[PDB]
Amino acid sequence: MEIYEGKLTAEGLRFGIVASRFNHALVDRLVEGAIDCIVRHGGREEDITLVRVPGSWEIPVAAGELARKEDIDAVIAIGVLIRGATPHFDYIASEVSKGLANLSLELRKPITFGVITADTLEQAIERAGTKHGNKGWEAALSAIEMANLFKSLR
Template sequence: MTKFLEGNDDGSPLRIAVVVADFNSDITSALLDGCLQTLRDRGVNEDSITVAHVPGAFELPGVCDKFAASGSYDAVIALGAVIRGDTPHFDYVAGECARGIMQVMLARKPPVVFGVLTTDTLEQAQLRASTTDCGISSADEAGREQKTSRQSNKGAESAVVALYMSKLYAAI
């Protein structure tokens, strides 16, 4: 008989580490707010959440690795925002950050969630860090209001993924 494994987003018994990059802090603080609120809403006890701040996205994998290796957490969430500029710096930081977090996820026991925005513009990052889950309106060239797709806080989404994946890992 086929066995189906699933996670869920009940966080009540879980211990969660969140590592947040301070660079682009207007964006990353909104991601953190969404993440923490979602963890609390899903039943994670305030005393079971640890938050560590790092200077930028490049430093995220190292601290995620320390948390994951400690054995004290059921999931680790990395939050950051890398916004494209005029130099190739974006490509190096975004790529190595993603690669580093993936390496930690594959090498360690708890799930490590990639909640790092990699956007072309500040506006794109702001939309993905929004604390409202509603249609975003903007004007086209003729000044007519245009409705864009629904946006939500990617920090909140990362929290849900962390809870789900930690329960799935436990079921395997």
């Protein structure tokens, strides 16, 4: 049998990080874990390109210009969505996810999903550093494995 799988070594890879600005407080702890993961697995922080967009709605279009440059091996999307009074939550949540997934089949490149979709302000703080451990350090780990496996599979 042929078994393919990405190792977790980050040397030689160049990364893109698309990070919304809304929910300034929680996103800055995710971007912190994300860079943290990439450096302690052996990647340099020079080869990280960090892009900032105003809301989570526009993560799709801007991760589309990072994922087209040749020298980017994987792209991480990092944004916080908290439900409020209206269904505004759903139609933005539903679209962030389709643009990211639709983009990944198009450009045949890994785009990992580091978007926190929380119901209360409580659960967002737990997945951004405390009792569940930041998505940011996680979605970054997912891309290091993918961008590593996509040397073998292409």
